[PDB]
Amino acid sequence: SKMSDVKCTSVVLLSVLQQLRVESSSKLWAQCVQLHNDILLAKDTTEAFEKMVSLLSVLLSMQGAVDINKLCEEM
Amino acid sequence: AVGACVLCNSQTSLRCGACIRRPFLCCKCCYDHVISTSHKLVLSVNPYVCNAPGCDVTDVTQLYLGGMSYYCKSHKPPISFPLCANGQVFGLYKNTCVGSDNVTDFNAIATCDWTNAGDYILANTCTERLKLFAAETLKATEETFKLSYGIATVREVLSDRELHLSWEVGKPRPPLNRNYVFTGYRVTKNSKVQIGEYTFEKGDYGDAVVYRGTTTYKLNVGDYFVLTSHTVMPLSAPTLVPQEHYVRITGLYPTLNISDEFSSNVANYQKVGMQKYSTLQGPPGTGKSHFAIGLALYYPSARIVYTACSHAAVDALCEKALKYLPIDKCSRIIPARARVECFDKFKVNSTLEQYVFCTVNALPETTADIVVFDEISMATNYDLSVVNARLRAKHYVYIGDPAQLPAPRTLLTKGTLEPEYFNSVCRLMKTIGPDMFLGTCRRCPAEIVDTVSALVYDNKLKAHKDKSAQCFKMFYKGVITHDVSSAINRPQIGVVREFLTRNPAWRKAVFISPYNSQNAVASKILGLPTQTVDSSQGSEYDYVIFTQTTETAHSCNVNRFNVAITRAKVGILCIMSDRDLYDKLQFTSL
Amino acid sequence: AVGACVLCNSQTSLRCGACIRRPFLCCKCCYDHVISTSHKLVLSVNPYVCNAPGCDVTDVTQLYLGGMSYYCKSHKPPISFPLCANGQVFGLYKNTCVGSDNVTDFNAIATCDWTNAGDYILANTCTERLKLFAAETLKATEETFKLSYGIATVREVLSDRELHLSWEVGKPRPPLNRNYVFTGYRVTKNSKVQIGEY
Amino acid sequence: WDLLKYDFTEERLKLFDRYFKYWDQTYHPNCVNCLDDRCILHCANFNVLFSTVFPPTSFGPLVRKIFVDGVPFVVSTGYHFRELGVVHNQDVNLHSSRLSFKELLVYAADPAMHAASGNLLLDKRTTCFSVAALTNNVAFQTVKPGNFNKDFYDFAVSKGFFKEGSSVELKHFFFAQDGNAAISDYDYYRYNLPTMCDIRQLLFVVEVVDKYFDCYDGGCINANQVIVNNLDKSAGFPFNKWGKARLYYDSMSYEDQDALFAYTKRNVIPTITQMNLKYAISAKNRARTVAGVSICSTMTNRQFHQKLLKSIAATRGATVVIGTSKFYGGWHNMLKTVYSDVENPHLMGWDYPKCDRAMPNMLRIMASLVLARKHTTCCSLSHRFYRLANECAQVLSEMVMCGGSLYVKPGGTSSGDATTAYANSVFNICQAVTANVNALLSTDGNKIADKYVRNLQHRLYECLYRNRDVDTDFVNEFYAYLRKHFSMMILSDDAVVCFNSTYASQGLVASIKNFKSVLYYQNNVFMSEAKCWTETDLTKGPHEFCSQHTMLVKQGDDYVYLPYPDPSRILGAGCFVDDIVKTDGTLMIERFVSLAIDAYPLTKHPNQEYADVFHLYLQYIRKLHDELTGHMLDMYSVMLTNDNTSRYWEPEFYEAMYTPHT
Amino acid sequence: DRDAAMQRKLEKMADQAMTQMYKQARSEDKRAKVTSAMQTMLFTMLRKLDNDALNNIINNARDGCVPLNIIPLTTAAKLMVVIPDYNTYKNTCDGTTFTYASALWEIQQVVDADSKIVQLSEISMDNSPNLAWPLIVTALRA
Amino acid sequence: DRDAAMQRKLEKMADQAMTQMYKQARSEDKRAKVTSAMQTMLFTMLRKLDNDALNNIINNARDGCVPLNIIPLTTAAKLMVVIPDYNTYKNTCDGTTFTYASALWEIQQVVDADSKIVQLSEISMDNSPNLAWPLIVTALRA
Ligand SMILES: Nc1ncnc2c1ncn2[C@@H]1O[C@H](COP(=O)(O)OP(=O)(O)O)[C@@H](O)[C@H]1O
Ligand SMILES: [Mg+2]
Ligand SMILES: [Zn+2]
Ligand SMILES: [Zn+2]
Ligand SMILES: [Zn+2]
Ligand SMILES: [Zn+2]
Numbered sequence A: 001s002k003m004s005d006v007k008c009t010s011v012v013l014l015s016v017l018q019q020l021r022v023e024s025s026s027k028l029w030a031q032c033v034q035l036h037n038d039i040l041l042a043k044d045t046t047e048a049f050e051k052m053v054s055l056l057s058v059l060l061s062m063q064g065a066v067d068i069n070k071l072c073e074e075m
Numbered sequence B: 001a002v003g004a005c006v007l008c009n010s011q012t013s014l015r016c017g018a019c020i021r022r023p024f025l026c027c028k029c030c031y032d033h034v035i036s037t038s039h040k041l042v043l044s045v046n047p048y049v050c051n052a053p054g055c056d057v058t059d060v061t062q063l064y065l066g067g068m069s070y071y072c073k074s075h076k077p078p079i080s081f082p083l084c085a086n087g088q089v090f091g092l093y094k095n096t097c098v099g100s101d102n103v104t105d106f107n108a109i110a111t112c113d114w115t116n117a118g119d120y121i122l123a124n125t126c127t128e129r130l131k132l133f134a135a136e137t138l139k140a141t142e143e144t145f146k147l148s149y150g151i152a153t154v155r156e157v158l159s160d161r162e163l164h165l166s167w168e169v170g171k172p173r174p175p176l177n178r179n180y181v182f183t184g185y186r187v188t189k190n191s192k193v194q195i196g197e198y199t200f201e202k203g204d205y206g207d208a209v210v211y212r213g214t215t216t217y218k219l220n221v222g223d224y225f226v227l228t229s230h231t232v233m234p235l236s237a238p239t240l241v242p243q244e245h246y247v248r249i250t251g252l253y254p255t256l257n258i259s260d261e262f263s264s265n266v267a268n269y270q271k272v273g274m275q276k277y278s279t280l281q282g283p284p285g286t287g288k289s290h291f292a293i294g295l296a297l298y299y300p301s302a303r304i305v306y307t308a309c310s311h312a313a314v315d316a317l318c319e320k321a322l323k324y325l326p327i328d329k330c331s332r333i334i335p336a337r338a339r340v341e342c343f344d345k346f347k348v349n350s351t352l353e354q355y356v357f358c359t360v361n362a363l364p365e366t367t368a369d370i371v372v373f374d375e376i377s378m379a380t381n382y383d384l385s386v387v388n389a390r391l392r393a394k395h396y397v398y399i400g401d402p403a404q405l406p407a408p409r410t411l412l413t414k415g416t417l418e419p420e421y422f423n424s425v426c427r428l429m430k431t432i433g434p435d436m437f438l439g440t441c442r443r444c445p446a447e448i449v450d451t452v453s454a455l456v457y458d459n460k461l462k463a464h465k466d467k468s469a470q471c472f473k474m475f476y477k478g479v480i481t482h483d484v485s486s487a488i489n490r491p492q493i494g495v496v497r498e499f500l501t502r503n504p505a506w507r508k509a510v511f512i513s514p515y516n517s518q519n520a521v522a523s524k525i526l527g528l529p530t531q532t533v534d535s536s537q538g539s540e541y542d543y544v545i546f547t548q549t550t551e552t553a554h555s556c557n558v559n560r561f562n563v564a565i566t567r568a569k570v571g572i573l574c575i576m577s578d579r580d581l582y583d584k585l586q587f588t589s590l
Numbered sequence C: 001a002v003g004a005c006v007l008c009n010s011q012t013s014l015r016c017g018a019c020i021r022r023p024f025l026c027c028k029c030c031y032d033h034v035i036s037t038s039h040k041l042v043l044s045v046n047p048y049v050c051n052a053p054g055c056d057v058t059d060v061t062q063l064y065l066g067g068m069s070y071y072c073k074s075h076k077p078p079i080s081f082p083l084c085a086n087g088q089v090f091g092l093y094k095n096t097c098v099g100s101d102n103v104t105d106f107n108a109i110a111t112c113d114w115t116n117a118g119d120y121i122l123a124n125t126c127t128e129r130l131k132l133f134a135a136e137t138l139k140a141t142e143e144t145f146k147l148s149y150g151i152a153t154v155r156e157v158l159s160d161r162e163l164h165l166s167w168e169v170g171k172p173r174p175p176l177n178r179n180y181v182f183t184g185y186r187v188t189k190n191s192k193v194q195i196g197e198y
Numbered sequence D: 001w002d003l004l005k006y007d008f009t010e011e012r013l014k015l016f017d018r019y020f021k022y023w024d025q026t027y028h029p030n031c032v033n034c035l036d037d038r039c040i041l042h043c044a045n046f047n048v049l050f051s052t053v054f055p056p057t058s059f060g061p062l063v064r065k066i067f068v069d070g071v072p073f074v075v076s077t078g079y080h081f082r083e084l085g086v087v088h089n090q091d092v093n094l095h096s097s098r099l100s101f102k103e104l105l106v107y108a109a110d111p112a113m114h115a116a117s118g119n120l121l122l123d124k125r126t127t128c129f130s131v132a133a134l135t136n137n138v139a140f141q142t143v144k145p146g147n148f149n150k151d152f153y154d155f156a157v158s159k160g161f162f163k164e165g166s167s168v169e170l171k172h173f174f175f176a177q178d179g180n181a182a183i184s185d186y187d188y189y190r191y192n193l194p195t196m197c198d199i200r201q202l203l204f205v206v207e208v209v210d211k212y213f214d215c216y217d218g219g220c221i222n223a224n225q226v227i228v229n230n231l232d233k234s235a236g237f238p239f240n241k242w243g244k245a246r247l248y249y250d251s252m253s254y255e256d257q258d259a260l261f262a263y264t265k266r267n268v269i270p271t272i273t274q275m276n277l278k279y280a281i282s283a284k285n286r287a288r289t290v291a292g293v294s295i296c297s298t299m300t301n302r303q304f305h306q307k308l309l310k311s312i313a314a315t316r317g318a319t320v321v322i323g324t325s326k327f328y329g330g331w332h333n334m335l336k337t338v339y340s341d342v343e344n345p346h347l348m349g350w351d352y353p354k355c356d357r358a359m360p361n362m363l364r365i366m367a368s369l370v371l372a373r374k375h376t377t378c379c380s381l382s383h384r385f386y387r388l389a390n391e392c393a394q395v396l397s398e399m400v401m402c403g404g405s406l407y408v409k410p411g412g413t414s415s416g417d418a419t420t421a422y423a424n425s426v427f428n429i430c431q432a433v434t435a436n437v438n439a440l441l442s443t444d445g446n447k448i449a450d451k452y453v454r455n456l457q458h459r460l461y462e463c464l465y466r467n468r469d470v471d472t473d474f475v476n477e478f479y480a481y482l483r484k485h486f487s488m489m490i491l492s493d494d495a496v497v498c499f500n501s502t503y504a505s506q507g508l509v510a511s512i513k514n515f516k517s518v519l520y521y522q523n524n525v526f527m528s529e530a531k532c533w534t535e536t537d538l539t540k541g542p543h544e545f546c547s548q549h550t551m552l553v554k555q556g557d558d559y560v561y562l563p564y565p566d567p568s569r570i571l572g573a574g575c576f577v578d579d580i581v582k583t584d585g586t587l588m589i590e591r592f593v594s595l596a597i598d599a600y601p602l603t604k605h606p607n608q609e610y611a612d613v614f615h616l617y618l619q620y621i622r623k624l625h626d627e628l629t630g631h632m633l634d635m636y637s638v639m640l641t642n643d644n645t646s647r648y649w650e651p652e653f654y655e656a657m658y659t660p661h662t
Numbered sequence E, F: 001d002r003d004a005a006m007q008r009k010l011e012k013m014a015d016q017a018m019t020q021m022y023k024q025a026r027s028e029d030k031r032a033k034v035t036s037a038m039q040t041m042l043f044t045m046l047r048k049l050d051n052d053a054l055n056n057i058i059n060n061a062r063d064g065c066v067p068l069n070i071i072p073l074t075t076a077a078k079l080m081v082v083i084p085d086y087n088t089y090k091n092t093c094d095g096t097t098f099t100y101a102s103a104l105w106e107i108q109q110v111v112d113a114d115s116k117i118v119q120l121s122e123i124s125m126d127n128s129p130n131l132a133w134p135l136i137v138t139a140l141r142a
């Protein structure tokens, strides 16, 4: 059940991005929404994972939003 | 609503009633706090008053829960049980609570009045959560007692949309803030009880205020609004983030051949890099305030947030950064109040720059790479908690010297506080010693630093300068005009005026005096820039004009003389009243 | 609507319809005023009149609240109750009404027609809140009595410096001074508009 | 043309006399002069062509400067419909002093004031005419993604769902949209071309469609008989700034509601309608938009239509199945009234691509006129024409506010007016009857062996193109023919037909190709045959009606049709909620109870992975109740005294929801 | 029990009437507030009208009626062009002045989808990707 | 039974109050902490996936090697990633190749915090301290 798991991780990731006020930068929210809708409408798991990587790169790029160290240590 | 117990952090719903800050409490902890102290009122999701049509019995040891209401002993129903039973006060999460033995200190923290000098020492050696609660309640008590208000009462109720106002003549009035609450005090004799918390914002026409209330009772003729509580923002972050030692510099990228002046502190910059939070202790004018700038120049790629409690320290840091750091890629933050003049040379109110400067109370909810907290001697636990809550930074640097004047603590009027109880960082420095140390005067002449190297420091402070012989010690009695409860010395300022014409090199000096009224009136008499001892900490001044006004306990304390005199880069003129202080200083006899 | 009682500033939604300005009254004050003097008409958010298909009763003390309407004794449903009872008149905020024994001077200020000098001298002794209503009802009575005057009209084109007047006979002629203006009316084949004031 | 020119009566008459010179019927360019509702259709069908040679800036409300207590208002005192020509208000007050609530409401609803006050706009994102921009900066509206319900997904994957290669896989998600969602979706009105429907055939399809609506009764009702379903729903623009619909249904008494309604029966009230983005679970990423109509329009349209509209929703066994539930043996009753004795049944279902954005103006007017044939007594004829003009001015082609900007709606039904399901039902029956007429006429005629149907075709052509007055005998005969060989079941755009197969193969009744042709030349959309289904075996019901597949199960001693949904839909409704407080679970057990009620029929499905969804929901409800009792026994020391949730995780409670008794 | 149990229904009826009366009083207080809001909105729009040009165009009309769709087109003093891509910009509002609706508009401002000002020199063929389209250009009649 | 009816009415009111209080408390709790809960849930799921590319980029972002722009998917697209250390440079950069996101990128341009273009030759253990970290690597997919 890995294809039906990237499709949920993408939803959670886009919710996280929308809670960091990426919605306020249209040029970036457009790409994020495109990647989200493309992951959801995917068949081959490789494409879904590649778009997942590209979408998570949005969250990792902004440093002052999340605290990756604290969130990753706990898990 | 539910919360977490202050002293055990378990889920609960029982606030206490007579504590100033309206805390949350556990079940067993609430039983122990109300059974041992004078605080009896308890607030669950609904208050624990009696439910008779007329009755006021709030002692939770008495009331009984019947049906779905609370009744006193007299109005008790047949089938019910008392609240205060089996060592607990009835509330939510009854049997998933773990108590703690820290109620011995919590009782004292919530009971005291913050006027003695034992209360403050208790509020600096308890657990972290108790430290935070004590600081919060201390701030609330200060805002209630000091400069509190004039008793206001509504003459008539025009409407619930806008109230009427009448301030009592003789006392001042505090302005609107939803954080302010004016308790209802209809004190005639009929139910002298809080009838709600209210805040008042006046309109632009006539005498009317569009109030915002918290209760559902119309204002009575005799009802008054008395400022007996202020709601400080509840703080969460600990006073000091836990220490963690590293083995290499992480998140900070050192330079090579930084400069010539800061070459001596290379090892100290490494020490800052290798620890989470570091503390630098240095006697006055020994080089802390440029050590921050040298830290900046040793980690050029690291975003830095300089912060301080007052506005003078941040301004001195701004001076030195503009003198050393690239002026373009800096900034300076000013609050929405914009009450006080600031340092307008960087791009103001630009948070995203690599070098921010700010006051602790106006910091934005952001991150950083290192936050330099300057002059912690003026920092209460509240300020440390605020800076820890607002600024998430890889490295902290607390620079300051406890020997200089502490925070106001207006309520404190009995006893005396040792340096090591001003706040948590001062306790860390004076208990286990500072992580960095640099004692060698670099600002004021060798004469004055030699003077001060005995009063406060046991001649452990060295000087690398020349005695300019411009340190004049004068003995003028200076008749005192105790006008506004702040000593004003007309003869003293007149004598300064008559000897200010004799010294051509002292026309652009700075006036310092331990009394605000004297400082303010000195501006008109001779036109010099006046600055009180409290707000002059951090800045550097070439020629200083000091005037010790009265033989007292305020102006006569050694630390205030230290901070007042050590601000003279090249020379100072001091007028005096106390003979004992005249006995040990090494100045020119004039 | 809701407002403040004229003589105690208590929240209320009653209004004595019998008065000229229809002042607000609270349940206690309204009961006192409708039980003491001849005023027997009250207005809540809805008028206190018998809401029967055919009937005409307006006395509050002779009315009963039946179902979701008001009916008098003749045809009220078997369910209680009389609107006026317990020293009160049914209305809003019945649990916040504060009584006031100023119903006597209030009645004197309200029911009087301001003919004799007594009304004016007792109209200034009252409190400010009631004195304002006294002034308002004085002005309303003055305007109504002004409407009860003999109107005038220009006879024809007489002269630019002076005119001549014809009046509706049978009614008094108002005194003519700088403190007494009149508005022309244009009730011709077209409209009734005001062309000028003289 | 002169910019200020709005009256093109002479030009329309010149065009008619130049091209359709010998067309012998009368032609009133201004449809307000029409003799009846069969002369409004004719003249409007001519106008919808003659209005494509006139400037597009000339249509829309006709403003005029009036004075209220001496201050000058600019208010709309008429309209210039592309179809209905010039319409003038009969009650214009050039000099008013006081504005009551009615007049204030009217002058705040209409777009004249807002458009005149605001800036000029030039929107290159859309080809549709753009009127104005109210604010100084355009507003971009996005759509947030759904909130994942991790507890339920973990439970499902622990119950062996969502495995690779399963037949029940998530397909319904909450899709997000960028800031170009609202205006890139309003732009789909470009598919609404000006279509000139054939008139001698539309004026007969109208008669048959009206025969379909003969069982019902309707009329006008007083303001105190109108019942609003939910009063907290929005009130359109600009009324949404000051409150919901409750504020305006309370502030206005019944007297001043009847005043407004009777004002609309002799006046035109142009109105603005917002375009709101829909935040709901769907299987395709295109944004879904709904037209939020004002309250000044909905109040009066309710008072006008609601009697007929609630008589349609209270009749069982008719062609329009609205108000018929699928529970308590309702789906079986619908599917067995569809099979109303048709000789060689074959089930069929079509799909309208861009149904609400491609519907021609002529057919929306036709639907609005068929719904208004019930006012033969309550309303006069001018009252009915002005009500039709109000419907066209507020719904058909009116100003649309799409993110702080007024554009012009070219046409097509707005899907949020007071009559959207029923008007679209009338449309759907119209298209079905037109397909039947085309199929019957286009048949050769010498190959038709049944001598009755050959004469019926002969008389059908004669009654279309050789008669000017209705022939009610033949209309009844053709309607009986259709109900004997073309039984329909219509829900607002979704139709199931039980057509006779022999006739359809011969060509004597509509088939899929006939519907495709009819849609091509009366909707300007190509109905691909890959979305319309045909079922040759009635023992498994329609392939898909109302997004519910059908299956023949055994209940008690007999057999019944049960509707089961798409399992992916129910799973995606459980997993992806549209709020953060619906993710908690224990608060929302009624959510899962309703979802299990919907998903119960899957238990009787032959596919085990389909039948497992119901048991998944029951087990999750059991777990939710268990942990709810745990949490409420920790938050207190006493559990609920009477916890009657023990029946929601037993299949009997749901099993009783698909049994005919109640 | 003849008189009692009529009191319970008597008080029940009295409470029901009072609660309804409370509701009706609140209803007549919201009606006044919304009426005042509507009046203020209408009058504030009035103060925004460009009376000179509106009078000039309406006096030309025969009946005094003019189509609404032109009231802005011939009287609005400020024009906003929303542009989806660079080609449309170059084709519609190239330079600092352009011509629409048979008038001459001068571009006073240019903002992007984020409401961030965009200088007219930043809109180039090669700089197009770096801009957050669509671009809203605000111009004033000249 | 008269007394038991009142007992049951009080008990039912108590149950209603308990349920309503639970709903309110839990709803306010769930709304209060939504950002932290959502981020922790995100990373729980993101670890549960256990993909090579996601793990690589997350483990790099923990050390400070974060990308300055969205990782591109199309072949031969430009990626700008900050490299904070010589160990991070050594592990990912080999020769003129770059291992990132479980893919091989080709380095085009390495710049410093001084914004001065440096070459791959200067990046050596002995010479590493001289360079002004953190470097910025601009590379293309291969
Ligand atoms: N390495 C140095 N060599 C010479 N002068 C120095 C050096 N470091 C600092 N100073 C001087 O000493 C002063 C110290 O200022 P400051 O840091 O405010 O003192 P402190 O922090 O001890 O109160 C500065 O104004 C600076 O000009
Ligand atoms: Mg210093
Ligand atoms: Zn207490
Ligand atoms: Zn009591
Ligand atoms: Zn009266
Ligand atoms: Zn009163």
Ligand SMILES: [Zn+2]
Pocket: D026, D027, D028, D031, D033, D034, D035, D039, D040, D042, D043
């Ligand atoms: Zn006609």
Ligand SMILES: [Zn+2]
Pocket: D219, D220, D304, D375, D378, D379
């Ligand atoms: Zn009608």
